[PDB]
């Protein structure tokens, strides 16, 4: 997630990349991606749902001696239009800022979840990735992604490789 | 052997504005504003409008001799002047 | 939806075509663009 995303990841928004002796690859984290999708979808729908439908509305004619009415009628229409334009644009700017902040939080949270499981069985790199202190096959890579990593199992191999 | 954490990117050129930053390129977006139109007068849900042609409303209802083609128009979806 | 400048075939909440309308129409708004982001910042690498 540091220095840009992965154009090689196509099955979600958030995910993992791994390298081991059995071959490297990418996979999406579906729980993170789907929760993010549902949150954002509800938000877009709320923006739409709170703006009502425009119903038939037409203008009015006024006489030569009804200029004061004509001007009030116009004032009312311009006033309401200026207010709704303001509200529509402001709501979009406010939500676009939150969307992007939401997404940055979600990727950072996956990193911390992995960091927490690995503890002393891997070296933190500093680029949003970890290097194992033990040999790790596809099954342990899946375990870390699942959130079921067995730390004690590899703690002996790690302390020996760490020195 | 490694595990890296990251996120999606693509070739989208869609941009949005936010309060702190303008013209931000994003991977996915929603257009909330319609700007196209069919520049013709259409029927509404199957019913044609009444076109008054060269006639004003006063012409139409008083029966200006030249608003003859409207004397047989009994119903409409909307009126166009 | 019919406006004086043409008919509208749309499900979006807003339009920038015309304030006068007959039918079930998007709200007229004085804006050129109104767009939400749903995805991620598009920064590859």
């Amino acid at each position, epitope marked *: 997630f540091i220095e840009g995303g992965w154009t090689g990841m196509v099955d979600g928004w958030y995910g993992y990349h791994h390298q081991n002796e059995q071959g490297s690859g990418y996979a999406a984290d579906q729980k993170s991606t789907q929760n993010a999708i549902n949150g954002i979808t509800n938000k877009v729908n709320s923006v739409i749902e709170k703006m009502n439908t425009q119903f038939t509305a037409v203008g009015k004619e006024f006489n030569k001696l009804e200029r004061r009415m004509e001007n009030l009628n116009k004032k009312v*229409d*311009d006033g309401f*239009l200026d207010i709704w334009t303001y509200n529509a644009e402001l709501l979009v700017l406010l939500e676009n800022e939150r969307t992007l902040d939401f997404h940055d939080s979600n990727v950072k949270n996956l990193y911390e979840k992995v960091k927490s499981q690995l503890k002393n069985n891997a070296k933190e790199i500093g680029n949003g990735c970890f290097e194992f202190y033990h040999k790790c096959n596809n099954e342990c890579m899946e375990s870390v992604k699942n959130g079921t990593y067995d730390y004690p199992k590899y703690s002996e191999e790690s302390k020996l490789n760490r020195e | 052997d490694t595990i890296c954490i990251g996120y999606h990117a693509n070739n989208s050129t869609d941009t949005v504005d936010t309060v702190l930053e303008k013209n931000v390129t994003v991977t996915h977006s929603v257009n909330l504003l319609e*700007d*196209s*139109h*069919n*520049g*013709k007068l259409c029927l509404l849900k199957g019913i044609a409008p009444l076109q008054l042609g060269n006639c004003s409303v006063a012409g139409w209802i008083l029966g200006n001799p030249e608003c003859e083609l409207l004397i047989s128009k009994e119903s409409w979806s909307y009126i166009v002047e | 939806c019919q*406006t*004086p*400048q043409g008919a509208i075939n749309s499900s979006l909440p807003f339009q*920038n*075509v*015309h*304030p*006068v309308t007959i039918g079930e129409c998007p709200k007229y*708004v*004085r*804006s*050129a663009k109104l767009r939400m982001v749903t995805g991620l910042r598009n920064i590859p690498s």
Partner: antibody
Amino acid sequence: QVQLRESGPGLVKPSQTLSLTCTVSGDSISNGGLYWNWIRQRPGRGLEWIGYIYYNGVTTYNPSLRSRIAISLETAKNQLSLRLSSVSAADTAIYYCAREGWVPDYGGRNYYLDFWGQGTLVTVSS
Amino acid sequence: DIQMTQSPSSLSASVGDRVTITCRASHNIQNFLNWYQQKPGKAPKLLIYAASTLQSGVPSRFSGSGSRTDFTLTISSLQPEDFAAYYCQQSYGLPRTFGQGTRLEIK
């Protein structure tokens, strides 16, 4: 940048049909959703509007000339065209094509002509 | 058709002077009025877009305003390059019309 360029014979004989073409570049007449105009100026006179065509092929004309004027549009080549049947001396003019742009305003889109081309002078004679 | 009448048909003024060109519509056209500058031999240039706004690239010396029927084009500090015919255009109705034009001479 947006550029319009008119072209045609520059000389038509009486009772022939005049046909002019405008090539649009730096824009797209299949994507913008704008109206494309034709106007003319008779020497010594002010400007007269001829008509316009929209993206959907919807065409309108100046009612004084509607029986003679035909306007069309080919999106594949970004070209507009104008044809006037039964051409006479009165049709000597500089013909121009123009793009009609807009900004949403109170009361609806407020339209204007911004890109006007160069202008092609057509003489009617024999 | 909505008629546009410009006045005067011809105006002369010296460099640095102030030029006011007015236009009257036969019908209420609200804010739908454009102004154009035509140099001899060239297609007209857009100066004023909304009755009160300028087209980018137009010198700040140009301005204008107006209501329903009565509109004005003003040139402050007239320069030699402002020699042109000026036109009043309405964009409210479909049969678009231009006024007859005002010729602005310098000195």
